[PDB]
Amino acid sequence: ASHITKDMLPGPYPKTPEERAAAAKKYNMRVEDYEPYPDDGTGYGDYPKLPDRSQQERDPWYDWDHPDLRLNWGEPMHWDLDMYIRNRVDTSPTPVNWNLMCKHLFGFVAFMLFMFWVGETYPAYQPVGPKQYPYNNLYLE
Amino acid sequence: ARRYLGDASVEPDPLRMPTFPPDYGFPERKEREMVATQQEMNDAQLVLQQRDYCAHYLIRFLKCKRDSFPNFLACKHERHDWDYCEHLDYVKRMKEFERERRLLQRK
Amino acid sequence: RHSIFAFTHVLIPVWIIHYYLKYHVTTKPYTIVEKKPRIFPGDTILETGEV
Amino acid sequence: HAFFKAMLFMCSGSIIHSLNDEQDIRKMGGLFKAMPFTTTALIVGSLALTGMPFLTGFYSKDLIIEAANTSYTNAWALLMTLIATSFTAIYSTRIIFFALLGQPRFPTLVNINENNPLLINSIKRLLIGSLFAGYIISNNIPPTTIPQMTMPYYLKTTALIVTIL
Amino acid sequence: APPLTLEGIKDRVLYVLKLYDKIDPEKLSVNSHFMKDLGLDSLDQVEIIMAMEDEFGFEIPDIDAEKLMCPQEIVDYIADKKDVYE
Amino acid sequence: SWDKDVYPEPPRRTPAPSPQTSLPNPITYLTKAFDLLVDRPVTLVREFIERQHAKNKYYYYHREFRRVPDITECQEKDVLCMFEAEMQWRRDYKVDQEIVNIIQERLKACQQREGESHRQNCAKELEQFTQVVKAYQDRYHDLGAHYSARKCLAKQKQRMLAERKAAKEAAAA
Amino acid sequence: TTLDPAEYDISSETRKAQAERLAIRSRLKREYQLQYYDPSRRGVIEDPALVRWTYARSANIYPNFRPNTKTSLLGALFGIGPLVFWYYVFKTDRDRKEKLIQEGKLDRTFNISY
Amino acid sequence: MLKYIIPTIMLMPLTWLSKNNMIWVNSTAHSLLISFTSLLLMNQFGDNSLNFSLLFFSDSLSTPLLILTMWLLPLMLMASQHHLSKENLTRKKLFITMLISLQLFLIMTFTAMELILFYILFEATLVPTLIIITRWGNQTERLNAGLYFLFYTLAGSLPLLVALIYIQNTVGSLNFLMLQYWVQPVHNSWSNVFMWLACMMAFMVKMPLYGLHLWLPKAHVEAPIAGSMVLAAVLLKLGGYGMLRITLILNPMTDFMAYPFIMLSLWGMIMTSSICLRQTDLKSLIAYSSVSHMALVIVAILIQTPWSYMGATALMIAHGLTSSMLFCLANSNYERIHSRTMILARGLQTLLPLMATWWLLASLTNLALPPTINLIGELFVVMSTFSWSNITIILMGVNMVITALYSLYMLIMTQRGKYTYHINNISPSFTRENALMSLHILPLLLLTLNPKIILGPL
Amino acid sequence: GGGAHIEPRYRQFPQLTRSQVIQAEFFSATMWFWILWRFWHDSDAVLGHFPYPDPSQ
């Protein structure tokens, strides 16, 4: 049961060097890119002075990580930044966006113009005159 | 090519036909062509798209499948003859665009 | 043996599961709902003939 | 189809244990590095997957691509089904050309073994059941539909040559 | 299922000394320390295990470089990783 | 069992013979052996209970009720006679559920017995059943007062709309 | 596509005296390993990085909160927002559906259920 | 009830009358014996109807619902003994007696013969629950949560008395539900809105809408010894069923203003289960599951015309057994690790193998695997509100999607390893820990054979 | 381990058990005998064709 520095207070400009770290060592001497200034967007009750958010992100992927536990399995001491989206989210790929996936289905979007026609096997084209005439001509005889 | 109209009974599933529904029928040569027995076609448990032509030859063909039970071929040449019933039926139908391309031209 | 291992497995329930079957078609007003014979000509247990 | 890959997973399952793990198409080598039986079983089903010259599902594969012969289709559908048949051929020789062709390249201590009759009883039943499957099933079956049985000149047999290229 | 002993790891490390044409079969057995005739900077620190990168080669992390100077210190912790001798 | 007029079927009409060949048929090997292996442990045991069950008998009777009052009785502030008119009424709705169950099984009877044609034949079921279900939700199903089941407080008043609106207000029928 | 993710950059010599940030985490790990090894513990360590993670997320949002902005008054575009739209749909059905049900018929004879 | 209340009051001068530590075995022995007698005269027939004795019972005829109320006193005493056994026997005798005193009023409730006998017993609770909330919890936020549990339930229930006394001197007397044959209809007015609204809103405060659910993750989060009244508070929530007794009659023709209760509780259903996947307190994870597929009955009661009452009754005791056991899964595995943080309990599934089945067969009832009592309940609700409007399959279908990803997220957090810590957590799930975790699924899958016992009138 | 009936190697090509090759060569013969009904007798399309039905007048 710890009462001194239990959590944050209404910040984030309450002499920020006193916060990290009295406890909650988010910053070393309030210049660590994680000094508890980051109340991004005041007026929201979410994330006060808060040894917490908009810190660098996107994914402790639990790779080699040989200091010790380091990442996600083995539990280092004080490194929780924002979680519950990060035990299932990873890093950067090869290339970049070039959204060819919508362009991949665009090939049949052009072939939706081939959905307008038919596929009759006999005969071929003969597309220039009225000799084709899909249905029958005269009556019995 | 057959038919007549005003089906007496209101029985759907087009067995209510003139006699027998063809694919198109008849149409010219011959302008008529007949069929099997509808009282036997319903007596034989047989689905639609099998009440077309060459059915009576097939009703005698597939009978030998059970009439020769532990067999590998009831009649393989008749299968080539039922196909010859089928191919002569189908090339009779293939002469549409031989005519319809020409009969739709001026005269 | 292949004698008491095989006979205990299959042979006993077929005695059981038949007994809830023959004593069952006459009780329930629909038994198994078997289809027709699919005949071409005509003979079998009738008499009718065909050409 | 059910006789194909339960063979073929189990056929290659003898290979992954044989190197104790790689499951990569790299780092394999050729066919006969004391692998007589399963490479013979590989060249049957991967020849079935070519498009069936006389094999098992010839009575399933050929009769459907020649059921799309006369049809009211999209006309881009036959420009998408029959082109996919040609792509099924390079499926075959790819596992040949990396696992069954090349010089032996993989890290050492060749710890291969194939002689457990549990596996040999497994494959020898299904490979025999593979070949004579459709020639019993399709030979002994009630026909329900009217077949096509028409395929004129320059339009008929190229579906094999689709696989040959 | 195949086990292993410690007499095989002493040979393979020693053999790829002889497989390299830069190094003669006249250097010491377990401790030539690499610097005896190791050169230069790059390609005498990671290339010296680039032959075992193909053979053993279980991804060999960044810590493995400067421990590998002592050529017996290579032999030390390969037995620790792959669950080896007693 | 039952009575076959409630649950009809046509005869059996089962063909037979048709061998015609000296090709080896396994049907003589199958039915001429396995029928006896089941005949001993079934027929002898079922008969053994059948005398043992005929040692003594037990009785249960038909339960027929009394129907003196019917519908429009009684006066509004009464409770007693308007309890009996609901005890009348609820039995006339659990029963009329099950008569739809009987006719539906009659539709199940023809279709697995013919199967192949199944549409142009049997001539009766799709005419009978849709003249009963179309005679169901009218006046016998409080749609949508089905929640409280509204015995005689609404079961008459669909049928009031079937008299006060129907048959006179058609202008001019 | 989410994200760049900036896996290489420059240094040497932008603020070279930035070191011994590891001295923070080595102090914690020397505190932790001396805490973690002991012959009789029988129970977890507190580790208040979890304690400050729940209690600054469960409570301490409403004592923090002041409605000084309009991005917390944005919730009328999110709370009562779509709930307006679901009422607009459901009374167009059950009214257009209703008139067709009374004036004219749409269902068949075999609709006992319902 | 002839005498079910009369033996279960005789349980009360047995506990203090006993000796020393025998007080646990003496109470649980006799309390199981009522379960024969509870079944005994009840479940009779059956066609309009069973008025039972007098002005004290209509026997809970078409809605049984009451056998489940009698399992629990011999289910909670075996559950509560985990961390209770450090206090005095003089208070250990208390906590058994008020728990019986909660079962006494629930027995005359659900049957109740009237509507004004209902209310005074509908409000006869909330005094013995509040004693279990304030005393016998853990660290603070008990006391405000002791006040949030009041002042929603009590602010709403007082306009019942204004309306129920109003009916008693308007149309005859309400004293019987079977003098409700004469019912005048309730048309569209400006006073008949409020008669409908005040009579309805006091039931919404217990089975919550999306609004005014603000007390439900307060009392369940900060909660007694081992779910000991939390098992009771899940029955008590579904023991606000009496909307089935009222709204079937007694203003039957007001669907005109059902729509702000439909859309609030049909869109809230798709959101209040979605708002739980980022929970970090384990007992608050279950506490929002209890919001979501309880609020499916609120769109199942207001939509009338059964094939819904087939399912709306089966859903009241669907998670009567499910959500009870999930609290028992979390009242266990907290005795060993002293936090309810879901992060901390990892490294599991190797250490306690026998209770892996107890996780899954719990969470396989929310996936609900159709031959259970669960997807015989939802698939009557689905086929009911389809016939209201076709578009409701979308929201209720996405309800089925997210709760699939929701239930497994509580399972899969235990399938990890290496445990990093924890010289404690030795106790290999003793004989009591599996016994009170059993008797939940053992009736739950049993009744799926002949579930004609679980049906309304209907 | 227990039985070393197939020894590990240093790339010296451990061979077969001199009976596996018999079953191996037996199931190449059963399929190339099974090319019998592929050619003898089965053709490309045993249907018959049309001789260009132009004279329909």
Chain B partners of I50 at a C-beta cutoff of 8 Å?
Answer: 91, 94
Q: What sign does the dihedral D10-D15-D17-D21 (CA atoms) show?
A: negative
Closest by alpha carbon to H118, among H108, H128, H104?
H108
Question: Is it true that the peptide bond before H347 is cis, omega within 30 degrees of 0?
Answer: no
Contact of H270 with H398, CB cutoff 8 Å: yes
Distance CA D8, CA D10 (A): 5
Closest by alpha carbon to H406, among H269, H235, H273, H225?
H273
**Tokens encoding H131:** 């004693």
Residue H273 burial class via C-beta count within 10 angstroms: exposed 0-12, middle 13-18, buried 19 and up:
buried
- The amino acid present at D91, given as its one-letter code, is Y
- The structure tokens 């739950």 sit at H444
Distance CA A69, CA H416 (A): 14
Number of helices (H), then strands (E), belonging to chain A: the values are 1, 0
**Tokens encoding I47:** 């249907």
The b/e string for F116-147 (b: 16+ C-beta within 10 A; e otherwise) is bbbebebeebeeebeebbeebbeebbbeebbb
**H78 to each of F94, H93, H138, H444, I51, how far by Cα in Å?**
45, 15, 20, 20, 93
C36 contacts chain B (CB < 8 A) = yes
In 3-state terms, what secondary structure has residue A101? helix
| Contact yes or no for F119 and B13 at CB 8 A | yes
Coarse DSSP helix, strand, coil percentages of chain D, rounded to the nearest 5 percent: 50, 0, 50
Distance CA H42, CA G103 (A): 49
Longest Cα–Cα distance in chain A: 107
Distance CA A19, CA A9 (A): 10
Q: Is D29 left (phi over 0), alpha (psi -120 to 50) or beta?
A: left
Distance CA H360, CA H344 (A): 20
In 3-state terms, what secondary structure has residue D163? helix
User: Which residues, 6 or more positions from H239, have their beta carbon under 8 angstroms from its beta carbon?
Assistant: H69, H106, H109, H110
E1 contacts chain I (CB < 8 A) = yes
DSSP code for D98: I
Chains F and D touch (3+ CB pairs under 8 A): no
Chain C partners of F46 at a C-beta cutoff of 8 Å?
Answer: 19, 22-23
H-helix or E-strand spanning residue H78: helix H73-80
D101 backbone dihedrals φ, ψ, rounded to 5°: -115, -55
**Tokens encoding B1:** 């090519």
**Tokens encoding H345:** 């309990």
For chain E, what is the radius of gyration of the CA atoms?
A: 13
Contact of H133 with H145, CB cutoff 8 Å: yes
Contact of D74 with A115, CB cutoff 8 Å: yes
* Marked catalytic residue, from E11, E21, E41, E62: E41
Architecture of the domain delimited by E8-82: Orthogonal Bundle (1.10)
The b/e string for H285-320 (b: 16+ C-beta within 10 A; e otherwise) is bbbbbbbbbbbbbbbbbbbbbbbbbbbbbbbbbbbb
Closest by alpha carbon to I56, among B100, D62, D73, G53?
B100
Contact of H43 with H87, CB cutoff 8 Å: no
DSSP string of G63-109, one letter each residue: TT----SSSSGGGGGTSSHHHHHHHHHHTTTTTHHHHHHHSS--S-T
Question: Is it true that the peptide bond before H328 is cis, omega within 30 degrees of 0?
Answer: no
DSSP E strand stretches across A1-141: none
**D115 to each of D36, H106, H300, I17, I22, how far by Cα in Å?**
11, 72, 64, 8, 13
Q: What sign does the dihedral A136-B1-B5-B10 (CA atoms) show?
A: negative
Q: At what angle do helices H282-292 and H319-331 cross, to 10 degrees?
A: 170
d(CA F146, nearest CA chain B) in Å = 36
DSSP string of B3-31, one letter each residue: --S--SS---SS-SSSSS--SS---STTS
Q: Is A74 left (phi over 0), alpha (psi -120 to 50) or beta?
A: left
Chain A partners of B27 at a C-beta cutoff of 8 Å?
Answer: 136, 140
Q: How many residues does chain A have?
A: 141
Q: Residues H349, H350, H352, H353: what is their CA dihedral angle, to the nearest 10 degrees? A: 80
- The structure tokens 């003859």 sit at B81
Closest by alpha carbon to H1, among H48, H77, H70?
H70
Q: Vertex G65, ends G64 and G70: CA angle to 5°?
A: 145
Chain I partners of E3 at a C-beta cutoff of 8 Å?
Answer: 1
Contact of E67 with E75, CB cutoff 8 Å: no
Q: Residues H220, H225, H227, H228: what is their CA dihedral angle, to the nearest 10 degrees? A: -110
Contact of E31 with E72, CB cutoff 8 Å: yes
Distance CA A17, CA D16 (A): 58
**Tokens encoding H408:** 């497994």
- D30 beta partners: D101
Distance CA B62, CA F146 (A): 56
**E67 to each of E63, E76, F28, how far by Cα in Å?**
7, 10, 83
- D101 beta partners: D30
Q: Residues D142, D144, D149, D155: what is their CA dihedral angle, to the nearest 10 degrees? A: -120
| Contact yes or no for C40 and B44 at CB 8 A | yes
A67 contacts chain E (CB < 8 A) = no
**Tokens encoding C29:** 């007003």
Chain H partners of F82 at a C-beta cutoff of 8 Å?
Answer: 181
Distance CA A88, CA F108 (A): 53
14-73 in F: which are within 8 Å (CB) of H? none
Chains B and A touch (3+ CB pairs under 8 A): yes
Contact of A20 with A26, CB cutoff 8 Å: yes
Task: State how far Cα A96 lies from the chain centre.
Answer: 14
The b/e string for H426-453 (b: 16+ C-beta within 10 A; e otherwise) is eeebeeebeebbeebbeebbebeeeeee
- The amino acid present at C5, given as its one-letter code, is F
- The structure tokens 């079957």 sit at C21
**F77 to each of A24, H179, H180, how far by Cα in Å?**
78, 10, 11
Q: What sign does the dihedral G61-G66-G72-G73 (CA atoms) show?
A: positive
Q: Vertex G48, ends G45 and G54: CA angle to 5°?
A: 120
Q: What sign does the dihedral A4-A9-A14-A16 (CA atoms) show?
A: positive
Distance CA H378, CA H311 (A): 6
Longest Cα–Cα distance in chain E: 42
Closest by alpha carbon to H48, among A129, F151, D165, F117?
F151
Where does H239-308 have alpha helices with state H? 243-246, 259-272, 282-292, 298-301
Other CB atoms closer than 10 Å to residue D70's CB: what's the count? 14
**Tokens encoding C10:** 């299959």
Distance CA H10, CA I39 (A): 94
Distance CA H203, CA H122 (A): 10
End-to-end CA distance of chain E: 17
- Quick check: is E83 catalytic? no
Nearest to A114 among D69, D72, D75 (CB): D75
